[PDB]
From a paper:
Despite retaining several characteristics of a canonical CP, the homodimeric Plasmodium berghei (Pb)CP exhibits crucial differences to the canonical heterodimers.
To gain structural insight into the unusual homodimerization of PbCPαα, we determined the structure of a C-terminally truncated PbCPαα homodimer (PbCPααΔC20), which was the only version of the parasite CPs that produced well-diffracting crystals, to 2.2-Å resolution. The two PbCPαΔC20 subunits form a structure that is less compact and intertwined than the canonical heterodimer, verifying earlier small-angle X-ray scattering (SAXS) and thermal stability analyses. Albeit being a homodimer, the structure is not completely symmetric. The H5 helix of PbCPα1ΔC20 is broken at His267 and turns back towards the same subunit in a β-hairpin-like structure (Leu268-Leu286), instead of extending into PbCPα2ΔC20, resulting in very different C termini in the subunits.
Numbering used by the authors:
A (entry chain B): 4 to 103, 109 to 133, 156 to 165, 170 to 289
B (entry chain A): 2 to 286
Write the structure that this text describes.
């Protein structure tokens, strides 16, 4: 019976629109606070969702932690610009503690980071994070942006994830990307959808560190204007079907 | 206790935010979890009855009749059907009639009832003349045969007029309802058109206030809750002739419903660039 309480908590999270998810969980623990069996079930479920979806967790003023597979370290999460691993609570979405590998990779990682921030800063400027992660050996660039119409009403989530792995170390590179976008209508929060665009582009670079970053950042800017074009024709298409189905509601014969 | 109030806050929040088409499923899941608790069974019943009243829900009555649930029909804990002269006891979770208490009929109706009867007849005629019938919900230029079981619409329509008397001032509430179903039981839309006039017999001018609510609730196989509303407030010239009074009110309703048709037929999709961030993806010209 206590087992049946678990399956429906999942269903509660399944279809709910994104802007509303935070609220419900907050109360779900308070609802089931004495049941440690479903409390551990909840801690498990939220960490996955939060990791699956690149949740932004704010730290101090003007920083963000990105919760995902790629930043996970043990059960903590890496912020590469600072040299810090963070312990977080997934339910509340806040940081609760902080405790701080080729030498050359780091400065390729950095240069991508700095031109990444410059790009987001001019054109994205609402929650907006950008970070570059480095790891048989590739670099990961990431822009996250959550827009709200007002207060807590979700307008969009933009997740743009880019990985490049090097055999040809200095002359030609492979850059793969995924842009995941979630949008909810202000007119109706039950009208919402997710779309995903994949890219696999080859880029020319030199032994120059920053041209390596600038060339990659030139590709992202263009791939992102591309997805955007697709999206604005998907919105208008949907909006237009909404109008068409709404006019079918009029019960009068149509003159 | 503290939890009882937090369980309520949660039940309220989920039923508040749920689109109409998920409410029933949502309630059922709430009962399995909290079903032994008669306080929250009753809390849920209260919340749903008010919800039902807020949405001019239709409950089928006998063959081909409907009770309409809303403030204006409320009588005690019952609901009036003004033409049959029946108070209906309803189950709000089940959306069914569970008892009826007939009113004693009057050999002679007083004058208010004569206004109500006249407004009732013109309201029904109006729907008859101007609302789509079966061949008009057809997806064709012309009325043809509907092909296959699944293909087609089920449409449920109801209208009613209610009368009350507040300190010798009269009041009439006129109401039209249509609900469209895809397949047979997927609720697609509601149309709710509601009209009040508060007036004296001697008045030659009345104020007719109205509200027209259009809600799309099925869209690309999802339950949604896309609402459009237009409110109206019209001065109408009338006389002591009761039937002409009904015709004048009905002429304004005819025009206001035409005005919404025009509005809906001139909505377009916004093609601004900031669409993702744009509060208005649907706009008029
Ligand atoms: Br939202
Ligand atoms: Br950042
Ligand atoms: Br954006
Ligand atoms: Br909404
Ligand atoms: Br209709
Ligand atoms: Br409450
Ligand atoms: Br309970
Ligand atoms: Br019955
Ligand atoms: Br009556
Ligand atoms: Br009636
Ligand atoms: Br029941
Ligand atoms: Br009866
Ligand atoms: Br009577
Ligand atoms: Br008449
Ligand atoms: Br009826
Ligand atoms: Br009718
Ligand atoms: Br549809
Ligand atoms: Br759905
Ligand atoms: Br309004
Ligand atoms: Br008006
Ligand atoms: Br108007
Ligand atoms: Br007169
Ligand atoms: Br008369
Ligand atoms: Br008019
Ligand atoms: Br028109």
């Amino acid at each position: 019976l206590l087992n049946e309480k678990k399956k429906f908590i999942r269903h509660v999270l399944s279809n709910a629109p994104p802007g509303k998810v935070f609220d419900l969980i907050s109360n779900l623990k308070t609802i089931f606070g004495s049941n440690a069996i479903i409390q551990n079930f909840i801690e498990d479920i939220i960490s996955k969702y939060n990791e699956d979806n690149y949740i932004l967790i704010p730290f101090e003023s003007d920083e963000y932690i990105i919760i995902c597979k790629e930043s996970k370290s043990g059960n903590l999460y890496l912020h590469p610009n600072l040299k810090i691993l963070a312990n977080v609570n997934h339910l509340k979405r806040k940081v609760i503690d902080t405790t701080p590998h080729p030498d050359i990779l780091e400065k390729y990682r950095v240069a991508c980071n700095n031109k990444l921030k410059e790009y987001v800063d001019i054109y994205y400027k609402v929650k907006c994070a950008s970070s570059v992660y480095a790891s048989k050996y590739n670099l990961f660039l990431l822009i996250c942006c959550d827009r709200y119409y007002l207060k807590n009403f979700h307008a969009s989530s933009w997740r743009s994830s880019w990985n490049v792995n090097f055999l040809e170390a200095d002359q030609e590179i492979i850059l793969t990307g995924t842009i995941d976008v979630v949008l909810t209508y202000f007119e109706d929060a039950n009208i919402n959808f997710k779309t995903r665009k994949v890219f696999e582009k080859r880029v020319s670079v030199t032994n120059d560190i920053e041209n390596f970053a600038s060339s990659i950042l030139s590709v992202i800017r263009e791939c992102e204007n591309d997805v955007l074009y697709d999206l604005n024709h998907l919105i208008a298409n949907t909006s237009s079907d909404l109008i068409k189905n709404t006019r079918k509601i009029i019960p009068l014969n149509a003159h």
